[model samples]
Every structure is written in structure tokens, then in C-alpha cells.
Target: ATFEIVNRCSYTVWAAASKGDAALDAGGRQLNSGESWTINVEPGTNGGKIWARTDCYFDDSGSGICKTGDCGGLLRCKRFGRPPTTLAEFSLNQYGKDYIDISNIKGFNVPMDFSPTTRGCRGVRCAADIVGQCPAKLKAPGGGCNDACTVFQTSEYCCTTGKCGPTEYSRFFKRLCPDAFSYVLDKPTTVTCPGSSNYRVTFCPT
Candidate 1:
């Protein structure tokens, strides 16, 4: 499988991807507006996720910080990005199907759209205007909206108990991005593509 990351926003965006390995494609490059990068995914890949980083300042050596989605201050992330980032989650060649979705469970920074490059699969997106109207309590310090779990950390908000479900806070995000996972266990947000399909992930899609 292959994933193409596209930046359609007016400003530059640093992107990152994690496949549970230190050598994963951690975006260190500055993708100027309208630029795009493609990455190939091998068979049997698992727990794949891609996201964008905003408001960053880095030195020549790739040592710096991103205000929204910093991954340990390193250009190549050995782990998942920090909270308040829009996420494109995927699991390919597993369970006889490819699972894909835009997740706001960590909250959203930039708008995103995920779709198969070829025909035969439906597209899913969360291109709503989340940042402009984020609730004060869930707003990220630098920018974007933080999930209730990140803001409150309560069992109900975090769904730590597995018995908890969406709260008013989660619904706030859900109302905006109806196709996204607004909270933990938001099962309805996910969609499937045949394992053979390639995907395109776009940031700030109009």
C-alpha cells in the first residue's frame, strides 16, 4: 500500500507518520503550501498513523519544537505525536480489510481528508472549521482543539473505564466533524477500503 501526504493549506505544514518503529517516516521536511510527499507501505504493516505539525521552529540540525504536534523535539519521531493534532489512522492488510479514518479523538488542528486514490472505496473526511470555534476549555494553548480526555483526564472524558461513552465535550467535536472519531470508542467513524487500494491524505482540503 502507499500513502500520499498532501498539503493544500495556505501555509507550510510539517507532517509526520508513525508505524510503531523508531525509523518510521517522521516528517522533518517543511512542506510549503501545495507540496506533497508519498510513502510506500509494506505488507503486514500495523497501527499506522499520519498527522500534521504546525507552528514549528527548528534549527539546521532538526532540533526544535512544534507548538501543536511535537514528537519529542526530534525530526524523526520514534513515537506518536503530541495531542491536539488531526490524525489520519490506518490499519492495512488486517482483518481482511483496510481500516481508515480521520480521528479527532486527540482533537483537531488542521482540516483533513482521506480518500482512496483509485475508485471503489468511499472517502472520509473531517474538513470542518474546528480551530476557529473550539470551546475555551478544550482549546489548545498554541492552536487547535484538545480532546476532552486531554483537557479533563476524567474517566468519563477519557473513557478509561471502557464503560464510558461520549459526553457533551465529545459531542462538540462530533457535531463539527461528523465522520471523525470524536472520542474513544467512536466506532462509527471508521470506514474500510480493500487492502489493495492506495490512499491520499490531504491537509486543509477545500
Candidate 2:
């Protein structure tokens, strides 16, 4: 199986992934506009997450911070990315299928599409223009939008109580990308695919 990371936007997007605790740059890389990178994944590689970092400026020493999706200011992210960015979550070889979702639970920085390249699997995506429509309270200083959980940090917004449902804040994201995980408890966002299928992850798909 493989993941074809494509950039279809007009600007740059630094792609990152978490496969085994090591930095995404160790195996994967950044993608410029119209560029693509294919990562051949092994079977049983579970709990992998892919995300995009924007407005990064690193020198030869690989020391800089990204305006969005920054991970400890390292060019090589040893851990998961920061909030205010879109995330593509995945679990491979789980109960005969691969579970995937485009999650905005942490917030949204860019539009994205995740679809299987093979014929048997269906496509799932969240291609909404959220940055431009971000609410004032949830807007980030640089760019992108912050989630209610990130902004409020309350049990109601973070769903820490496990009984919290959708609020007006969560509904904002749901309105834009109905297929995405707008909040922590949003269950319908998940998509399933065969274990043998490859994927095409596109940034800003039409």
C-alpha cells in the first residue's frame, strides 16, 4: 500500500506524518505547489496521521517555526503537529479494513481530500474554505481557524465529560465540511477501505 501526497494549491504546504514516533521528514517530505510525494507503507502500520504545515521558514540547520501546524519548531517533527491545522487520520489493518478520516477537531488551516486510488474503495474529503470564513473568536493570529476545544478548553467544548454534544462552535465546522470530524464526538466522519488499497491525499482538491 502507498500514500500519494499531492499539492494542488497555489502555495506551499509542508507535509508531515507520524508512522512510528520518528519525524515525518525522516521518511516523507515537504510538497510544493503541484508537487507530489508517494510513501510506500508497510502492512500493519497502524495509528498513522498525516498533516500539512504552512508558512514555514527553515534554514540549513532545519530550525524554524511554522505559522500553522508547527511541531516544536523542528523541521523534523518528532511528535504530532500543533493545532489550527487539518489532519488526515488513519489506522491500517484493523478488522480487515483501514479506517480513515479528515479531522478538523483541532481546527483547520487548509482544504484537503483523501481518497483511495484503487477501484473498490470510496472517497472521503473535507475541501471547505475554512480559513477565509473563520469566526472571530476562533481565528488564529497568523492564519487558519482554531477549534472550540482549543479556544475555550472547557468540558463542553473539549467533550471531557463524554456527554457534551454539538455546540454552535462545533456546528460552524460541520457546516463547512459535513464529512469531517468537527468535534471529538463526531462519529460519522470515519471512512473505511480495503487493506490493499492505495490512497491519494490531495491538498485543496478543486
Candidate 3:
């Protein structure tokens, strides 16, 4: 499977993908506005997630802080990103198919469109102004919104107790991006495509 990461946002974003070992793009890269990066996925890639870090400053050592989606402040991430990130989650060649979704379970930052460029399957997107309209309570320090779990760490929001449902907080995010996985149990929002499909993750899609 092939994946293309495009930065349509007006600003630059440090994009990262973690397919366990991040066998693609060396895990991370600097994507300036209007630029794109393409990566080929190994067969049966699972537990893979792609996200973009905003408002970052990096030294030659590739260490820095980002306003959102910072993964241990490293340019090449070896870990999942921090909270307050919009995610493009993917599982390719699972059950002879590929599963894809736009997830806000970590929170929302850049608007996104995750879709297949080939095979003509489902395409999910979250392009609302979540950062601008984010409620004060769930707002992050630099930008974007945080999941209720990130802000409160309560079992109800985090689903740590294995029991969860939509709350006022989750509903707010759901309203912004109905096609996205608004909460942890939002399995129905996940879409599927052919295993051979080529996927595209576009940030700030209009």
C-alpha cells in the first residue's frame, strides 16, 4: 500500500507516522505548505497512525517543542504523539481490506481529509474550524482543542474503565467532524477500502 501526506495548511507542519517502528519516511519530516510526502507501507501494516505537529522550532539535532502533536520533542518520532492532535489512523491488509478513519480522540488541530486515491472507496474528513470554535474548557495552551480525557483524565472521558459514551465534550467534537471517530468507542465511523488502495492524508482540506 502507498500513502501520501499532503500539507494544505497555510503554515508548516512537522508530520509523523508511527507504524510501530515507523517503517515509512523515517518516522517524521518537515512539510511546508503545499508540499507533500509519499510513503509505501509494508503488507499488513497495523496500528499505524499519522499526525502533524504545529508551530514547532527544531535544532539541528531534530529536538524541539511543538504547539500540538509533539512526540517527545523529536523530529524523528519513535513514540505516539502527545494529545491535542488530529489523527489519520490506518490498518492496511486487515482481513483482506484496509481500515481508515479520521480520529479526534486525542483532540483536534488541523482539518483533515483521509481518503483513498485509488480503488474508489470511502473517504473520511474533518475540516471544520475546531480550533476557532473550541470551547474554553477543552482548549489547549498553544492551539487546537484537547479531548476531555486529556483535560480531565476521568474514566468516563478516557474510557479507561472500559465503559464509555458520548458526553457533552465528545458531542462537541462530533458535531464538528461527524465522519471522524469522536470518542474511543466510535467504531462505526471507521471506513474501509481495498487492501491495494493508495491512500492520501490531506491537512487543511477545504
C-alpha local distance difference test of each model = 0.83, 0.83, 0.88
- Please give the range of 10 consecutive residues that has the lowest summed lDDT in model 2: 20-29
lDDT of 1 by residue, 1-206 (tens): 77898999998888887775643454445778999988776655687788889988888888789988788886666667888889888888886788888889888999999999976678889998998888989888888899999988898888888878878888888999989998887767778788767999999998
Q: What are the per-residue Cα lDDT tens digits for candidate 2 across 1-206? A: 68899999899998877764764435436789999988766666677778889999887877788899887777767777788979888888887888888889999998999998887667778887898888999999978999999888999999998888988988999999998988888867787888767888899997
Clashing pairs in 3: none
Worst 10 residues of 1 by lDDT: 20-29
Return whichever of 2 and 3 wins on lDDT: 3
Reference-based lDDT, residue 202, model 2: 96
Candidate 1: how many backbone clashes? 0
Clashes of each: 0, 0, 0
Q: What is the lDDT of candidate 1?
A: 0.83
Residue 112 in candidate 3 has what lDDT?
93
* Residue 21 error, candidate 3, Å: 5.2
What are the root-mean-square deviations of the candidates from the true structure over C-alphas? 1.4, 1.6, 1.3
